[PDB]
Ligand binder design. Structure first.
Ligand SMILES: COC(=O)[C@H]1C[C@H](OC[C@H]2O[C@H](OCCN=[N+]=[N-])[C@@H](O)[C@@H](O)[C@@H]2O)[C@@H](O[C@H]2O[C@H](CO)[C@@H](O)[C@H](O)[C@@H]2O)C[C@@H]1C(=O)OC
Ligand SMILES: [Ca+2]
Ligand SMILES: [Ca+2]
Ligand SMILES: [Ca+2]
Ligand SMILES: [Cl-]
Ligand SMILES: [Cl-]
Ligand SMILES: [Cl-]
Length: 130
Protein backbone atom coordinates (compact mmCIF):
# COMPACT_ATOMS: atom_id res chain seq x y z
CA UNK A 1 0.00 0.00 0.00
CA UNK A 2 0.95 3.62 -0.53
CA UNK A 3 1.62 5.99 2.37
CA UNK A 4 -1.21 8.10 3.79
CA UNK A 5 -2.16 10.80 1.27
CA UNK A 6 -0.45 9.21 -1.68
CA UNK A 7 -1.89 7.88 -4.91
CA UNK A 8 -1.23 4.37 -6.31
CA UNK A 9 -0.84 3.56 -10.01
CA UNK A 10 0.93 0.58 -11.65
CA UNK A 11 3.10 -0.33 -8.68
CA UNK A 12 4.24 3.24 -7.91
CA UNK A 13 3.09 5.69 -5.30
CA UNK A 14 2.67 9.36 -6.21
CA UNK A 15 2.50 12.35 -3.91
CA UNK A 16 0.32 15.14 -5.27
CA UNK A 17 1.43 18.12 -3.17
CA UNK A 18 -0.94 20.43 -1.43
CA UNK A 19 1.54 23.34 -1.24
CA UNK A 20 3.49 25.01 -4.11
CA UNK A 21 7.23 25.16 -4.86
CA UNK A 22 9.44 26.25 -7.69
CA UNK A 23 10.84 23.47 -9.87
CA UNK A 24 14.19 23.04 -8.04
CA UNK A 25 12.56 23.05 -4.64
CA UNK A 26 10.07 20.43 -5.89
CA UNK A 27 13.03 18.20 -6.82
CA UNK A 28 14.37 18.66 -3.28
CA UNK A 29 11.02 18.00 -1.62
CA UNK A 30 10.73 14.68 -3.48
CA UNK A 31 14.28 13.66 -2.56
CA UNK A 32 13.33 14.36 1.13
CA UNK A 33 10.71 11.60 0.98
CA UNK A 34 12.93 9.13 -1.00
CA UNK A 35 11.08 9.92 -4.25
CA UNK A 36 11.69 11.81 -7.49
CA UNK A 37 9.87 14.69 -9.15
CA UNK A 38 7.89 12.56 -11.54
CA UNK A 39 9.57 11.09 -14.61
CA UNK A 40 6.95 9.66 -16.96
CA UNK A 41 7.85 6.29 -18.54
CA UNK A 42 4.68 5.31 -20.44
CA UNK A 43 1.63 6.56 -22.27
CA UNK A 44 -0.70 5.18 -19.61
CA UNK A 45 1.19 6.87 -16.82
CA UNK A 46 1.00 10.16 -18.75
CA UNK A 47 -2.72 9.77 -19.31
CA UNK A 48 -3.23 8.99 -15.62
CA UNK A 49 -1.17 11.86 -14.25
CA UNK A 50 -2.49 14.39 -16.79
CA UNK A 51 -6.04 13.60 -15.77
CA UNK A 52 -5.27 14.03 -12.04
CA UNK A 53 -3.86 17.46 -12.70
CA UNK A 54 -6.61 18.54 -15.12
CA UNK A 55 -9.52 17.55 -12.90
CA UNK A 56 -7.87 19.09 -9.80
CA UNK A 57 -7.47 22.37 -11.72
CA UNK A 58 -3.82 22.54 -10.56
CA UNK A 59 -0.77 23.57 -12.55
CA UNK A 60 1.75 20.92 -11.56
CA UNK A 61 5.49 20.38 -12.13
CA UNK A 62 6.93 17.19 -13.55
CA UNK A 63 10.67 16.25 -13.66
CA UNK A 64 11.38 17.56 -17.18
CA UNK A 65 13.44 20.60 -18.30
CA UNK A 66 15.39 22.20 -21.16
CA UNK A 67 17.52 24.26 -18.72
CA UNK A 68 20.75 22.70 -20.03
CA UNK A 69 20.20 23.03 -23.75
CA UNK A 70 17.27 25.11 -25.01
CA UNK A 71 14.91 22.92 -26.98
CA UNK A 72 16.41 19.66 -25.76
CA UNK A 73 14.13 18.32 -23.05
CA UNK A 74 15.64 15.95 -20.44
CA UNK A 75 13.99 14.13 -17.53
CA UNK A 76 15.56 14.53 -14.08
CA UNK A 77 16.79 10.88 -14.22
CA UNK A 78 18.87 11.84 -17.30
CA UNK A 79 16.62 10.18 -19.90
CA UNK A 80 15.87 12.13 -23.07
CA UNK A 81 12.38 13.19 -24.02
CA UNK A 82 11.35 10.65 -26.67
CA UNK A 83 9.90 12.12 -29.86
CA UNK A 84 6.67 10.19 -29.40
CA UNK A 85 6.14 11.81 -25.95
CA UNK A 86 6.23 15.25 -27.64
CA UNK A 87 2.62 14.53 -28.56
CA UNK A 88 1.75 15.42 -24.96
CA UNK A 89 2.71 19.10 -25.25
CA UNK A 90 -0.36 21.30 -25.51
CA UNK A 91 -0.89 22.79 -28.96
CA UNK A 92 1.66 25.59 -29.47
CA UNK A 93 4.01 24.32 -26.72
CA UNK A 94 6.78 24.36 -25.85
CA UNK A 95 6.96 28.04 -26.86
CA UNK A 96 9.70 29.37 -24.54
CA UNK A 97 7.82 32.63 -23.96
CA UNK A 98 10.08 34.87 -22.01
CA UNK A 99 12.35 31.82 -21.53
CA UNK A 100 10.48 28.83 -20.06
CA UNK A 101 12.65 25.88 -19.18
CA UNK A 102 10.55 23.56 -16.98
CA UNK A 103 7.51 21.42 -17.86
CA UNK A 104 4.15 21.33 -16.10
CA UNK A 105 0.84 19.59 -16.52
CA UNK A 106 -1.53 22.31 -17.69
CA UNK A 107 -5.08 21.30 -18.74
CA UNK A 108 -4.98 18.32 -21.06
CA UNK A 109 -1.28 18.40 -21.89
CA UNK A 110 2.08 19.86 -21.02
CA UNK A 111 3.29 23.46 -20.96
CA UNK A 112 6.75 24.92 -20.62
CA UNK A 113 6.82 27.60 -17.95
CA UNK A 114 9.25 29.58 -15.79
CA UNK A 115 11.22 27.34 -13.52
CA UNK A 116 11.16 29.86 -10.63
CA UNK A 117 7.31 29.85 -10.58
CA UNK A 118 5.77 28.02 -7.65
CA UNK A 119 3.39 25.24 -8.67
CA UNK A 120 2.05 22.06 -7.18
CA UNK A 121 4.27 19.05 -7.83
CA UNK A 122 4.10 15.28 -8.04
CA UNK A 123 6.67 12.91 -6.65
CA UNK A 124 7.00 9.27 -7.70
CA UNK A 125 8.52 6.27 -5.90
CA UNK A 126 8.05 2.53 -6.00
CA UNK A 127 5.29 1.03 -3.84
CA UNK A 128 7.73 -1.66 -2.84
CA UNK A 129 10.13 1.04 -1.53
CA UNK A 130 7.28 2.76 0.34
C1 LIG B 1 5.74 37.42 -22.18
O1 LIG B 1 5.11 36.37 -21.37
C2 LIG B 1 3.93 36.80 -20.83
O2 LIG B 1 3.94 37.74 -20.04
C3 LIG B 1 2.59 36.11 -21.18
C4 LIG B 1 2.75 35.14 -22.35
C5 LIG B 1 1.37 34.62 -22.71
O3 LIG B 1 0.45 35.70 -23.05
C6 LIG B 1 1.01 36.60 -24.03
C7 LIG B 1 0.85 35.96 -25.41
O4 LIG B 1 -0.55 35.75 -25.66
C8 LIG B 1 -0.82 35.16 -26.96
O5 LIG B 1 -0.25 33.85 -27.08
C9 LIG B 1 -1.19 32.84 -26.64
C10 LIG B 1 -0.29 31.74 -26.06
N1 LIG B 1 1.06 32.22 -26.39
N2 LIG B 1 2.09 32.55 -26.69
N3 LIG B 1 3.12 32.88 -27.00
C11 LIG B 1 -0.26 36.02 -28.09
O6 LIG B 1 -1.04 37.22 -28.20
C12 LIG B 1 1.23 36.39 -27.90
O7 LIG B 1 1.57 37.44 -28.82
C13 LIG B 1 1.55 36.85 -26.46
O8 LIG B 1 2.98 36.78 -26.24
C14 LIG B 1 0.73 33.91 -21.53
O9 LIG B 1 1.62 32.80 -21.20
C15 LIG B 1 0.98 31.74 -20.56
O10 LIG B 1 0.10 30.97 -21.41
C16 LIG B 1 0.70 30.42 -22.60
C17 LIG B 1 -0.36 29.60 -23.25
O11 LIG B 1 -1.40 30.50 -23.74
C18 LIG B 1 1.88 29.52 -22.10
O12 LIG B 1 2.61 29.00 -23.23
C19 LIG B 1 2.83 30.24 -21.22
O13 LIG B 1 3.82 29.31 -20.77
C20 LIG B 1 2.14 30.92 -20.03
O14 LIG B 1 1.63 29.93 -19.13
C21 LIG B 1 0.64 34.78 -20.25
C22 LIG B 1 2.02 35.38 -19.96
C23 LIG B 1 1.91 36.32 -18.76
O15 LIG B 1 2.93 36.79 -18.24
O16 LIG B 1 0.68 36.62 -18.25
C24 LIG B 1 0.22 37.81 -18.92
CA1 LIG C 1 16.29 28.48 -21.95
CA1 LIG D 1 13.03 26.56 -22.90
CA1 LIG E 1 4.79 27.88 -22.58
CL1 LIG F 1 -2.60 1.86 -2.26
CL1 LIG G 1 15.78 13.58 -8.59
CL1 LIG H 1 12.72 29.22 -16.87
Amino acid sequence: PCPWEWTFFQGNCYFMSNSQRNWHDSITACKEVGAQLVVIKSAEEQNFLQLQSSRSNRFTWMGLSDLNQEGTWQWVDGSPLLPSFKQYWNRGEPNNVGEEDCAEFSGNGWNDDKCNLAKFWICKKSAASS
